[PDB]
Write a protein that binds this DNA or RNA. Structure first.
Lengths: 51, 159, 222, 58, 172, 185
RNA sequence: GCCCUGAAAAUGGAUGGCGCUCAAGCGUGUUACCUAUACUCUACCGUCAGGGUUGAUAUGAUGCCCUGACGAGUAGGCAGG
RNA sequence: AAGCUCGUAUCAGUUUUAUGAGGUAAAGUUAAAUAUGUAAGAAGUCCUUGUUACUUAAUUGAACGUGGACAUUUGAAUGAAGAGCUUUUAGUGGGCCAUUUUUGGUAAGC
RNA sequence: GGAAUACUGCCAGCUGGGACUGAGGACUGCGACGUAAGUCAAGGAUGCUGGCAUAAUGGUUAUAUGCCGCCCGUCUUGAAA
RNA sequence: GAAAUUGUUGAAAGGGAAGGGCAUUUGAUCAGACA
């Protein structure tokens, strides 16, 4: 009779998308990133700093 | 006053193609047209008998009638709000085939091959034609090619 | 009668499976998206460490929005807009990008504003504004039976499968993208920016290809 | 008291209201104009092939 | 045009079997965002090589941050702008903090004095003047004298409230 | 506003229900709006829309045409249906047995059908005998055999027989109908 | 580039008016804000299309209900009062 | 306006691929841009063996057929308040403007 | 050699204030939460309290105020003319 | 025994017309309802 938006009204958001519960409980929205060591090679930086 | 003739205002239209004047070459007459063929109409200004009106220049039609020196042609002509189906009597100097059917039959046969080939290949055909896609990923290699900085250039007279 | 009792927990078991299969199947679409956004990040890093460059794959999908009113349109664009299902100001649908559809947009650019949608906006539009087309009738989705009784022949048995078929531009994109009624948007929440919309986005108007800047304009319109 | 004689304005627009309908072309078109000599034989070609089965079909 | 950024753009000539691996040209573009940046890049490669957006590519788009954002610098700038009755060349020296903050100040000067739109102006070169006395223009040399001190001519009182009971005073 | 590719508020151009005020007619329209809905077989859905047909669109099916459709192979045991009136044809001197179900029979075609040991039916009894339509033949009478349709589309070189009062010499046979006076057509 | 000169028409006199000079003018840039019968969401009226419903033991089968979409209009035509 | 036969369906003020025609702008014979014709399949393709009084030097062609085989990535994109069909009749047959081109005219709210 | 902020973008992140609407009217469905019974914000509003029973609310009509509002029918490309 | 139109009384209004629409205040009136 009336359309209940997800993205508010959590109960309708959980009939659609049964993965909405285990998404939040594990976060995964704020999930952290692995750390990397790579640096730009001296040619790339030479180009960027150039005239 | 105004003048609307049969060939009126065809000045540049039936001209003979500079340094192509003279007698028609003889593969024009060795070409065999059949009922069900699709043909393109380009008038030949040197052969007056059997010559289509200036509306049918470049138009494409099908052969319903084959006769001694000529062939039948069905055209769809827009008049008013509708298309009328015209029948035309033209000599074979004014006709030639259109290659879209030669190229179409070439793809029909290839499609026959691939499928019947793929019938022992376990389908996964991909037998349509698809438009040019957006180009996939890649990695350029700057090694050996260094980006060359360019800039706009000042104005000059140079007169 | 058995009826009510004996066909309930018999049926209610099948209900459990649809969303237990939607449970596992959506988990796989979240790990698929994230590791793709990661590899595009790792690739630009692995290249710059080789002294080289990395060109992105071009964007296979755009979202078009009709920016102009309904009258004083020349005949040729007015026929195009009707073939993209842009029937009013502020509406729009997803458009697959191939050489065929891409020379249409060049005709209508004064009349639309389009760009490259992120998974963010594809997810908001479909949840909030997403409707189905069922015997015409423009149905709101709100449920998994509306999608499964129509697109289930293709797979696409949840609303998480639409958003997947839309953003991956999968094989069935035509069936799915025509199963969605054209999105009826509102005007932008914070305004359009700029005094005048009908210059090109590069001269300071609203139309044309604004690329990934379409993600921000649509959200104010959603 | 001269008039406004000719214009084509609005005529292409009136044309697309019901909009340029097609041939509605058929299988077996009309043999109007076909070669009378071919057409005579074609009578008896079909005339014979119908009776061709009247010997087989019985 | 906006509150500017400065980008570098890189792209080559879609590869063909005849001439693979083209020459990867590069430019430094002053524009607000990447969209206006790229579309302003192909504008200056159509004046140089055989390219256009369909016949060419953008390999890299990167933003160039000012290296010493806090140090006052002296910039001379060479400008090609299209006037009403023709086109010309100009050299204007800008004393500002950073590259992109100097550009934003040049259009405002071109717009104000010469009535030249962002579309009428080509920025030929922007480079820092290292040693003073290489600064040719007098209004920039104005600020380079030793231990300079000046007032705030006629202190300008922004009026906050409708009525005031004092009369104000322009002392500073 | 919306940009329409179609004309708005545009009816389908069909008979949703007869224009007749006949009472017994509407009892069949009532009987077949029920079966068309709940019986899932298309026969009922065909007979329904045939009860809405106007008179000109209901030509009579002669009792001779009924005998052809029985000579039609395998159909000699079928129950022919005619929504319309069955009329008599005496030009046939033999008639099969079978069955017929129609709205109206003429008094002649009632005798002839009853004469052979066959049977005349109404539509209501057919609905009771075969609700789904098991083993039935619908038959339509010729529509374009009318006197007016002979005149439809008059115009040069179409051979459509002008609408005219009196037929004979001296009435519109002269200029334009023959080469000797003027032209032809 | 801006300004002035070139620059003279008849009732009193019109950047719309007042009035405005580090503008309330001119060139340009970033923002905030105002509001159409257009856009989104809701209710209601009507129009169209698609479906549901004939079982006594009530009062409408031109009936009841379900679902959607749509609504400018002269000359003109039609349906219902 | 009245409807009629039908309903997955041939279409389309649109692109794309393929392929013709053009002789204006620029160029100084060449030749655009925008518009324009056709094709992208079942009324199809491949084979096999029938008909004729036309055609052939001819069991050779043409046109139409029998029997067999290949169905939905079936032959490019997008869209389609469904496709077609007919009858019947009103009003109108003084137009005007703007844009992009252009002739007459010195120009014009010509 | 390290960082932090800035900017961009995302979260099926958290919480607070304001305005508008309350259609429908036995149950049905899909979910959520609970071992369980059950409950819930899940196919559209309920609970608690107070006041006046009044011309208080509401209508109807004259006036006043703010903004708006040209004279009808006709011919006409074009009429307030 | 209508309307134009008029005399009397009562009410309201009035700065080069009058009259209208949306909105509410003020004055006069009106039920319904409740209970």
């Amino acid at each position: 009779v009336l359309k209940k938006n997800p993205l508010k009204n959590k109960q309708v958001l959980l009939r659609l998308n049964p993965y909405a519960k285990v998404f939040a409980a594990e976060k995964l929205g704020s999930k952290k990133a692995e750390k990397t060591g790579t640096k730009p090679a001296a040619v790339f930086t030479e180009t960027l700093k150039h005239d | 006053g105004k003048s609307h003739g049969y060939r009126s205002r065809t000045r540049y239209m039936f001209q003979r193609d500079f340094r192509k004047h003279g007698a028609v070459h003889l593969s024009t007459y060795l070409k065999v047209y059949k009922v069900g063929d699709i043909v393109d109409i380009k008038a030949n200004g040197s052969i007056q008998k059997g010559m289509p009106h200036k509306f049918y220049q470049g138009k494409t039609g099908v052969v319903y009638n084959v006769t001694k020196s000529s062939v039948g042609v069905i055209i769809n002509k827009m008049v008013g709000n509708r298309y009328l189906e015209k029948r035309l009597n033209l000599r074979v100097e004014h006709i030639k085939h259109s290659k879209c059917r030669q190229e179409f039959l070439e793809r029909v046969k290839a499609n026959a091959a691939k499928r019947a080939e793929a019938k022992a290949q376990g389908v996964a055909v991909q037998l349509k034609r698809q438009p040019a896609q957006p180009r996939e990923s890649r990695i350029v290699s700057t090694e050996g090619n260094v980006p060359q900085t360019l800039a706009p250039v000042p104005y000059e007279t140079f007169i | 009668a058995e009826q009510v009792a004996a066909e309930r927990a018999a049926r209610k078991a099948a209900n459990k499976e649809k969303r237990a299969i939607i449970l596992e199947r959506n988990a796989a679409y979240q790990k698929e998206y994230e590791t793709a956004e990661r590899n595009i990040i790792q690739a630009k890093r692995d290249a710059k460490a080789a002294g080289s460059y990395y060109v992105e794959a071009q964007h296979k999908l755009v979202f078009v929005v009709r920016i102009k009113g309904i009258n004083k349109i020349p005949p040729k664009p007015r026929k195009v807009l009707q073939l993209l299902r842009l029937t009013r100001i502020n509406s729009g649908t997803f458009v697959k990008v191939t050489k065929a559809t891409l020379e249409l947009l060049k005709l209508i650019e004064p009349y639309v504003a389009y760009g490259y949608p992120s998974y963010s906006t594809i997810r908001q539009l479909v949840y909030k504004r997403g409707f189905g087309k069922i015997n015409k009738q423009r149905v709101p989705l709100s449920d998994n039976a509306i999608i499964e009784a129509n697109l289930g022949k293709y797979g696409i048995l949840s609303i998480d499968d639409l958003i997947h078929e839309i953003i991956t531009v999968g094989p069935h994109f035509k069936q799915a993208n025509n199963f969605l009624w054209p999105f009826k948007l509102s005007n932008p929440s914070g305004g359009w920016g700029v005094p005048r919309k009908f210059k090109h986005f590069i001269q300071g108007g609203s139309f044309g290809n604004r690329e990934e800047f379409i993600n921000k304009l649509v959200k104010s319109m959603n | 008291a001269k008039s406004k004689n000719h214009t084509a304005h609005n005529q292409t627009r009136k044309a697309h209201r019901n909009g340029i309908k097609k041939p509605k072309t058929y299988k077996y078109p009309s043999l109007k104009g076909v070669d009378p000599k071919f057409r005579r034989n074609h009578k008896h070609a079909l005339h014979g092939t119908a009776k061709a089965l009247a010997a087989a079909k019985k | 045009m906006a509150h500017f950024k400065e980008y570098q753009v890189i792209g080559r000539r879609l590869p063909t079997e005849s001439v693979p691996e083209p020459k990867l040209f590069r430019m430094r573009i002053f524009a607000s965002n990447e969209v206006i940046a790229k579309s302003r890049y192909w504008y200056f490669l159509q004046k140089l090589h055989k390219v256009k957006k369909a016949s060419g590519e953008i390999v890299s788009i990167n933003q160039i941050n000012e290296a010493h954002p806090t140090k006052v610098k002296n910039f001379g700038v060479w400008v090609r702008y299209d006037s009403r009755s023709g086109t010309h060349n100009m050299y204007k020296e800008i004393r500002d903090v950073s590259r992109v903050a100097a550009v934003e100040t040049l259009y405002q000067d071109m717009a104000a004095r010469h009535r030249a739109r962002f579309r009428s102006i080509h920025i030929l070169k922007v480079a820092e003047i290292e040693k003073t006395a290489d600064v040719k223009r007098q209004y920039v040399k104005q600020f380079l004298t030793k231990d300079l001190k000046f007032p705030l001519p006629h202190r300008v009182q922004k009026s906050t409230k409708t009525f005031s009971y004092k009369r104000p005073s322009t002392f500073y | 506003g919306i940009d329409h590719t179609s004309k708005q508020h545009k009816r389908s151009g069909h008979r949703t229900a007869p224009k007749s005020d006949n009472v017994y007619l509407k009892l069949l329209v009532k009987l077949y709006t029920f079966l068309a809905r709940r019986t899932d077989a298309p026969f009922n859905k065909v007979v329904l829309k045939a009860l809405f047909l106007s008179k000109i669109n209901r030509p009579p099916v002669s009792v001779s045409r009924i005998a052809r459709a029985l000579k039609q192979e395998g159909a000699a045991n079928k129950t022919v249906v005619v929504v319309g009136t069955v009329t008599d044809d005496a030009r046939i001197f033999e008639f099969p047995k079978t069955t017929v179900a129609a709205l109206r029979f003429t008094a002649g075609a009632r005798a002839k059908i009853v004469k052979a040991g066959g049977e005349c039916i109404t539509l209501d009894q057919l609905a009771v005998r075969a609700p789904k339509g098991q083993n039935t033949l619908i038959l339509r009478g010729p529509r374009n055999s009318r006197e007016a349709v002979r005149h439809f589309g008059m115009g040069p070189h179409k051979g459509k027989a002008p609408r005219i009062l009196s037929t004979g010499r001296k009435f519109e046979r002269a200029r334009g109908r023959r080469r000797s006076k003027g032209f032809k057509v």
